[model samples]
Target: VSVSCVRTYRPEIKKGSYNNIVVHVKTAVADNLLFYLGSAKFIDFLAIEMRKGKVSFLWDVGSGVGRVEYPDLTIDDSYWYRIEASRTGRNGSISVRALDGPKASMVPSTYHSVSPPGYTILDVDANAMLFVGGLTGKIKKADAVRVITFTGCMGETYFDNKPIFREKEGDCKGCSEGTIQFDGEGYALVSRPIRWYPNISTVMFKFRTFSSSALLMYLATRDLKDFMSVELSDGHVKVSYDLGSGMTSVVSNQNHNDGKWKAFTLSRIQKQANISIVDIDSNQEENVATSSSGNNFGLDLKADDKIYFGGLPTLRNLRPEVNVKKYSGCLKDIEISRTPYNILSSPDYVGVTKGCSLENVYTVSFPKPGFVELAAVSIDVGTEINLSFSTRNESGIILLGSQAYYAIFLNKGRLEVHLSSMRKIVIKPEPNRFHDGREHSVHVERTRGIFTVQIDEDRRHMQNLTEEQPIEVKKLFVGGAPPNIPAFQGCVWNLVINSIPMDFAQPIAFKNADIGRCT
Candidate 1:
């Protein structure tokens, strides 16, 4: 009989990838030392890290269980080996029963002659190198099962294993004595003593397990007043504030309350503010927003005042200032075009030409695409505006179309608008197939480099085209449709135009103090 040992890596093990290397003893021992017959003792085997033939860190010799034991070693994108059981000694002896090949194992001096056993080996990729154990007697130390070593970008790893802690209440093992506790069962009385009140401040205790009828109420205070005693009864709790002229308040529930403990917010109300207990419960908004009794109690509270809730104070400081500014009504010419089968209208509606003039203006054409010719008077600088109108064929068929045009010579410094047909281009019927014979409205709003185009307020699309480049506007024309496509026989009406430029500060939510609304 003979004893054989073998080791294997995972199949996908790539160079530089993190992985675990496992070693196994295949042949069982018969007639050997009691200590080395089955498994090694704590000092039997050793694992060492070597770089450039020099030793680095030695690990796992203190544990007897088989399986890879180095928990902190990260492989350096290269080949590594486990030089184990090479010397002869009293503890144990190591010998290679077979050379490097398939189905090979190691033999130890403590084992009698036995037939060699078969075993397979594998290599593991960097990301999949997190496993341990082989055959009899395997142990996983440290409790943590896996570890991540890198993070961010292409090859970054993040470690997110938090240790679990458990302890009994009233143990005070990890907590300080100064921590205050409330009798979560709607009682104003605290579960623990208040060691100190550092300043003219208030402490709050929230009961976390109750409902509207079940509240963890507290006696509101306008100063650093003391409370001689606090008590609770069937459905109510009371506390007395010891200010010379201070008053004590009682809070009682009319309806049956939930039997469980509930957390209610406790706060110190300022005396100079004339704040009252009614205002505290109402302003705390512990109940629903629309609850009538607490809706609007006439208490003047400044934004900077401190209202304690949820373990911290809700700071009420200066409100955000609303400073309105002017909108730059910069006009840039946007040339519009489409396949002759499709029709592209001006970004804004043109004014009425009256009688025969309307017929001529409706059928105007341009030499190129992406250009729109607006009447001179309609263009303005530094103001806000919207261009809205409707279009339909002589048969009243709406000329709604999609995927109709490509644009060039566009800039990002100013806002622009583009619209699609009534339905989403990809989700509904083709925009170019619309033939309802009824007019469809188009809305376009462009301001300071941002453009939004909408149709009937249902289909809308906006994009920041010239976001990185400054665009200057001079010439624009609505060119004829694409080659060989018939022109859309449609009428344009309600041609409206207003111009507004961008507000560099807070451009997304246009709030300027000087100008209420862009023209």
Candidate 2:
């Protein structure tokens, strides 16, 4: 008769790459052996048996090739044994303690520490399981041949905090007891599969880590010629990308190993690309831009490209000399977008900084007509304008009007769309609605004499006003009205004007404006 017992739990052990586990076993007879207790891949294991009336303990550090055997122990018919196994750095150790037999006491016990040749780095699979009795004999032929069995018999057995086999009055065959028992084949724990998205122009994610060096994210083609990666190396945040020819990277001077949640956005359009990182705790922002030159032109992403977060793909064939560090932290809100996307939701990841507010006051000028619109005709001929922005301002101006055209600003806690000399349309909501410091989406459109405004889910229209021909805007000030206007005191995100992203241009002049996650 043959039977095996198993138990598993999520240990969630913390370490750079190794783990330490201690197991205790007590048996009325020293004949039964405990087979394996570590990774299912046979990277680590422990075994016990009796040799010539003496107890023998055998275990491996990481791989089976580095097995250590401590033979010729003392008698242990009614003794309690405690086994400890640990993998530290590139080595491992296994110790055994034998308690008094008759009294089953811990006093006057023998201890031994067996050393193995070397240890290997094990995967960070939190799920750990234990196996008892002989190998199930049903494992794959390659793995089944390595199974070993104990010859002597046992009346009772105890493992860890539970009992595996109880003493029986009569003879019993194939008797096993546990929460989960396998009689035929050994079991293994499988990890969840990773997810990937290709052909995305924008990639955004928030992560928190205290590791000084780790691979935060990586996206690359199968050929490994074009790729983008974010890593914390040498106490600095490094963002690097390659597009066939060469690699370009930006390194942050500040260290991010202080254990805080941070958000990152990487967007690419044609040959121009932008990378932005925000320190959620301090609401600080770091922005970098990249453009194609005579030597290199951004990445050419395909629909089948691979994407990885928090770690590198195990199957990928990386250089043997290259050390790929794994991230040790939490991540949330991973998004990849092919179309225009906006940050409309607040960040609520683990270790995030809450109740953050920004009192930003900045001015973005369109020094030349060409700077506002790429097409020269659209600037002179005067085209219909559609402006949209999301903010949490309550009583200050959101945007100021230029001397050439009308302006959209907040007056007395209400949104006012004024046509300089013609008329003003006030789109006011319930009292204390917009001033609660919550995010609100505002949209304004102008077509001929028709002016439309939308605040959040509410929509309003004002028509039959004098037509303002040649509505040419020179300077669009954000977070406040022009000169002496009360500066908006809140967070602002995703400001767009006629399909043109407002944050695309470098700030000409900014004052007290923090560009990061403040909502």
Candidate 3:
């Protein structure tokens, strides 16, 4: 008697992707076939064949055949045995296990040697057919093979679950912790057309650098004058968006180097655009803004425009020495308008790695005059402000008022709070207070012309005698007073004005910081 069984699934298997299959079998007949699965091509297949009192698991990847022997078979079988096979790239592996039996044990399996360049494609259009008992030379009546469970082999691998592939070039020079790496001369070009609107649109990505200055990402047309780009100049992040007439850009105040990871986000809405650069380690964020009132108008995006990541593209007509600004870094989790396009898997890229090493605590130094501006905030009569920051500067202004109405400075290890020229309170903590290189919290409360400042457990109170003008404050400055005056060289965190929380992850422009030209 001859018996043949085959079953077809709805979705076909994908080419150049990983696939896993599992099946269970319980049979006592000698030389009976258990399963046969794979494409119509006989070379790209997996099969379980019964031979003289033993079972042989065999597989072939287009050219050569490989087998794993399971010896000492019996006809009095009662329990089911599980079999599994997986294929990744050009390699394949198989394993066998006993479901239930007296001699139940897991069998270690091995992989076949990758076949010689014959099988570049292994996808099948026909439904994965399974046959039992005998090999059917013709397409006869078929039934699906009975199995325990199967996963990761059903539908198309969508964006969320898709795998990331790495490509390397020229001795793998500067590798990092992402699936994509740019060699400072090559770039990944995405052909997907993006519709540009005058309203809100955003682009964001995480990047780790191997070079101090390079173009990280760019989107432009053939002319290149109308484009958007995110670049690092002298270790500071810079973003520029052009609508045709003129380009508007925002530059970061802090230098980001020493092989660290940072994030950049650019959002353009209506007439203005905001760019934020965040140091992932310290959660310190800096913001920059640009307006299109007198500059260019709308985004002149066309269907032929292309997006480039990790470097700028060199046109066929342009010369090689024209400064293309290629990026030497690793990029990950790149999103444009909420859609993720995989660049690592693209064949155009080379020299990719799994991940990059990152350090903690990005130290930002303000050698010249600079101050982080928290913008103009409304202040009532009894408004309270609290700040927490860490520094090791012996003498510098930490917080100040733009109009010199109030200022906080560290002078010779003493913390000074100047409400006005006449009303100044200095707290002389222990010897290591201001120069301890540690974090400290300070609280200030103003109610009915009475000012109370608290530093840790120490407190000082002062009553304003001249209350002719109700003290209405405008902007809050950190790191220095405004304009010239030595800026505070340190880190800051957790600032709250009244009950509203201030996030250090959002970008805020710092005045007087000598950041070079914003591109």
**Which candidate comes out best when scored by TM-score?**
3
Tens-place lDDT per residue, model 1, 402-482, is 132111111111112332211112112134322343444455444454555555445566554333222223222222221
lDDT of 3 by residue, 357-466 (tens): 33222222243455666655544457676776566776778766554367667787777776652466778886457657777777776667566678865655565634
Tell how far residue 457 is off in model 3, in angstroms.
1.3
Candidate 2, residue 181: Cα displacement in angstroms equals 49
Rank by lDDT, highest first. Answer: 3, 2, 1
TM-scores across all candidates?
0.17, 0.32, 0.37
Ten-residue stretch with the least lDDT total in model 3: 151-160
Off by over 4 Å in 3: 1-175, 178-216, 225-370, 378-381, 461-464, 481-485, 504-508, 511-519
* Candidate 2 off by > 4 Å: 1-393, 456-459, 463-468, 499-518
Residue 34 in candidate 2, Cα distance off native in Å: 24
- Rank order (by TM-score, best first): 3, 2, 1
What does the lDDT read for residue 396 in candidate 2? 62
Q: What is the C-alpha RMSD of each candidate to the true structure, in Å?
A: 27.0, 22.0, 19.2
Winning model by lDDT: 3
lDDT of 2 by residue, 341-448 (tens): 112232211222223222221112211111111121122122333444444444566655454555566666677776543566787777546756666777666666
Q: Between prediction 1 and prediction 2, which has the larger TM-score? A: 2
Q: lDDT of candidate 1 vs native?
A: 0.23
Comparing 2 and 3 on TM-score, the stronger one:
3
C-alpha local distance difference test of each model: 0.23, 0.48, 0.56
